[PDB]
Each structure stands twice: as C-alpha cells, then as structure tokens.
Amino acid sequence: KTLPKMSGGWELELNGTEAKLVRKVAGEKITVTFNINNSTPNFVVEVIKNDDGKKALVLDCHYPEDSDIFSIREVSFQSTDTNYTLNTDSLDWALYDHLMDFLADRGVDNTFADELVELSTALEHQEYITFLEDLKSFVKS
Amino acid sequence: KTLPKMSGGWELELNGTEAKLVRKVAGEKITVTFNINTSTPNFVVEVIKNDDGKKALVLDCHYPESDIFSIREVSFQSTKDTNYTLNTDSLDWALYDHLMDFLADRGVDNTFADELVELSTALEHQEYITFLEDLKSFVKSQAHHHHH
Amino acid sequence: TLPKMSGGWELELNGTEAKLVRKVAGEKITVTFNINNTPNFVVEVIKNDKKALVLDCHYPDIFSIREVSFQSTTNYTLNTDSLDWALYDHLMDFLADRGVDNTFADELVELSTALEHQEYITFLEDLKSFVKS
C-alpha cells in the first residue's frame, strides 16, 4: 500500500513509470531519476550547483552483477540535445573514488542504492497490479 | 501496380515509410501501424473504444522465426516513456490467448497477418522503384549522353 | 589550433556533433559527424530549386557511401549494395564535384582526431573542477 521511504530526506514525484527523488534540504539541486520499465533499476543522478545554474553533472548509475552496491557507468554535463559523455572505464581509480565520494556527500550511497531497489520493486508491483486491472477492464467483455 | 487488398474493409494511408491500416469494429477504431525497410514487418495494433477516446490499448506484434504472429508487449497510451509496458513472457497462457482472441475479433488474425506480408512486400517494391527514380532525377547532371 | 579543411568549409560544433558547411554554385553542402565514441560522416546536399539528398558515408577510395535517402528541409533509405556499380560511381563523382573527395576524407580523419582530444581534455578539466572540493 504505502510506498517505502528513502532515508536522508528525499521528495518522491511520480510520473507514470518515471520516478524522481529530490534531496529535500540541500545546498544544490540533487535529483535521482529512474524508470520501473527500464528490481535493480538504472538511475541517473543530476547535480546542479548554486554557483552556476547553467550546467548540471549527469551521472548514469547502475547495479553490477557479481563492496559498493552501485556503479557510475558514465558521466556528462547537461544544460538546464547532444553532450560529451565519458565512460568511467577510461577513468583512473582515484577519479572514480572522487566521483563516488561526491555522490556519498550528496546522500547517494550504499544505503540509498539498497533502498532504491526496495522502492523500485514496490513501484513496479503497484503499476503491474493496476495495469492488469485496466487490461481486464478493457479486454474482458 | 495496384497494391494488394486487405480483407475486412481496412483503409490504408502511407506517410513516408510508415503505413497505417484503419477499420471500425462496433464503434471501436482499430489501427495497425507498420514500417517499410520476404518482408515480414513488425506491426503495432492500437484499439480505441467508442466509450472513451482518452486511452488506447497498444499491442506490439511481430513475426517469429500455429499462429503466424506474436504479441511481444502490451501497454495503454493517451491519444512519453511514462506508460507501463508489460512484456507478454510474464503473462499466463490463458491471458495471452485471450489477447490473441481479442485481436482476431477485431480482424487482426492469421489471414490478416499473411495478407500484411503481401501488402508490406508490395509497398517496399513500390517505394524502392520511386526512390531510384527520385535518386536518378536528383543526380541527372552526371549523365554522359543526352537524348535530343 | 584545429587542422583546416581544404575547400573553405565553415566548422561549427554543438556538443559532440560537428558540422562542416560549404556554399557551392547554388547548392548548400553540409557534412555532419560525431566527435565522441575514422568517424562516420553524413553528407546533406540541398539544391537552389525543397528536399535534400542525404548520403551516409563511412571508412571501410578512402570512404564509401553506405546508404542514401531524401530528407525535407520516416524517409525511405536505400543501402548502396542494391545499386549497380555505375550509379554508385555517379554518386561518388557527385560528392567529389561538391568537395567531398579522398583529400576531404583524409583531412576529416585528422580534424576528427583533433576535436576528440580537445573535447576529452576540456571535459576532464570541467569534471575535476566540478567534483573538486
């Protein structure tokens, strides 16, 4: 019934299968976006600093397969469309550590990544149950 | 020359490589959309009921490699990745079969699928011939000989 | 300083997408390619007279036309393997008359490589600047 809460102070906004998590009290604009169709989802962290509202750092994260719960797959900047995107395999361990720490300082850590799996699983199930109902309502004569 | 006919009173319209077949089945509007580019295309069935024109059931179909076609996935769309899409592998056989029957009652059956292969192949050949003409017309400056 | 393209080509970069434009004798020729992972380039030819011939080129002659189509200024796209050698050669010549020849192809490799290392270096700087505290 009631969806699981995310620790660290986050506001959830739903728009169909697309969920946005916005850090409630922050010095910056931290948004985590994921989609129930696209349950370990793929999530995108968007960071907009106070200093310049023009550009945002976009970190495409995912859950690996067989210690950190998630990984940054690629990084890029986006204006608030095509932009330079760096894959993190081309980064040295020291810069990957800085990126992962940068996320942790903004509350995107292991607890958040574990909690996101629980929230995503719940949203998926909720949408799935509703879809079957709507489908029955439409197709059943 | 003349494109092959689809049984059931379907009305065809082509916009570039995208063909739409439309037919009314008891106030419900059924649209089958496919693209051009031996031609077994992937088609999308959109069902809009008279009762509510707000949403449509969208059934993504294809020809596998016995039913001639298969439903790959299903969703609702307003008449936009925000819509829940169910893959049919997660459906029980009876609901999948029910969906197949729902399509046949609206004329999207095996005969329709077989006829769509024939129409698709024809539209492909027609667009191909037209494209070569337009291409040759565009580079006509490259001719060595001139018929005078 | 980025390497120059022979023929008087105006370069513009929008993110990872570079466009080279040359105004011929009453025809506009645009070559588009991407600076982010020998690139694959797209030639767009618009005559003075509404539509444009789009030629998708790649490096296997230094380059090859992989496929052709028309676009207005969901379109039918023909692969060049289905074309006879004579018409394919007419298309190659048509490109060469508009400045898209072997020299252009070789020069585009050099420009592409330069744009890549430039964008890469700038990105790392911006990244480290953003993430540094």
Curated annotation (Swiss-Prot), chain A:
Q: Which residues carry this modification: Phosphoserine?
A: S67, S71
Role of this protein = Multifunctional and multicompartmental protein involved in inflammation and infection processes, ribosome biogenesis, protein synthesis in mitochondria, regulation of apoptosis, transcriptional regulation and pre-mRNA splicing. At the cell surface is thought to act as an endothelial receptor for plasma proteins of the complement and kallikrein-kinin cascades. Putative receptor for C1q; specifically binds to the globular 'heads' of C1q thus inhibiting C1; may perform the receptor function through a complex with C1qR/CD93. (Microbial infection) Involved in HIV-1 replication, presumably by contributing to splicing of viral RNA.
Question: What is an annotated GO biological process for this record, any one?
Answer: mitochondrial RNA catabolic process
Question: Residues bearing Phosphothreonine?
Answer: T80
Protein's name in the database: Complement component 1 Q subcomponent-binding protein, mitochondrial
Tissue specificity? Expressed on cell surface of peripheral blood cells (at protein level); Surface expression is reported for macrophages and monocyte-derived dendritic cells.
Swiss-Prot/TrEMBL keywords: Acetylation, Adaptive immunity, Apoptosis, Cell membrane, Complement pathway, Cytoplasm, Disease variant, DNA damage, Host-virus interaction, Immunity, Innate immunity, Membrane, Mitochondrion, mRNA processing, mRNA splicing, Nucleus, Phosphoprotein, Primary mitochondrial disease, Ribosome biogenesis, Secreted, Transcription, Transcription regulation, Transit peptide
Iron-sulfur recorded as keyword: no
Residues folding into a coiled coil are: none
Q: Hey, which family's this protein in?
A: Belongs to the MAM33 family.
**Membrane topology category:** Peripheral membrane protein
- Spell out the subunit comment: Homotrimer; three monomers form a donut-shaped structure with an unusually asymmetric charge distribution on the surface. Interacts with CDK13, HRK, VTN, NFYB, ADRA1B, FOXC1, DDX21, DDX50, NCL, SRSF1, SRSF9 and CDKN2A isoform smARF. Interacts with CD93; the association may represent a cell surface C1q receptor. Interacts with KRT1; the association represents a cell surface kininogen receptor. Interacts with CD209; the interaction is indicative for a C1q:C1QBP:CD209 signaling complex. Interacts with FBL and RRP1; the respective interactions with C1QBP are competitive.
Residues modified as Phosphotyrosine are Y63
Disease tied to this protein: Combined oxidative phosphorylation deficiency 33: An autosomal recessive disorder caused by multiple mitochondrial respiratory chain defects and impaired mitochondrial energy metabolism. Clinical manifestations are highly variable. Affected infants present with cardiomyopathy accompanied by multisystemic features involving liver, kidney, and brain. Death in infancy is observed in some patients. Children and adults present with myopathy and progressive external ophthalmoplegia.
Q: Which GO terms describe its molecular function?
A: adrenergic receptor binding; C5-methylcytidine-containing RNA reader activity; complement component C1q complex binding; deoxyribonuclease inhibitor activity; enzyme inhibitor activity; hyaluronic acid binding; kininogen binding; mitochondrial ribosome binding
Q: List, alphabetically, the GO terms of the cellular component aspect.
A: cell surface; cytoplasm; cytosol; extracellular space; GABA-ergic synapse; glutamatergic synapse; membrane; mitochondrial matrix
Q: Where in the cell is it found?
A: Mitochondrion matrix; Nucleus; Nucleus, Nucleolus; Cell membrane
Record's note on what induces expression: Enhanced cell surface expression upon platelet and monocyte activation.
Q: Which residues of the full protein are shown?
A: 100 to 281 of 282
Annotated spans, Interaction with MAVS: 43-79
Q: What is its main location?
A: mitochondrion
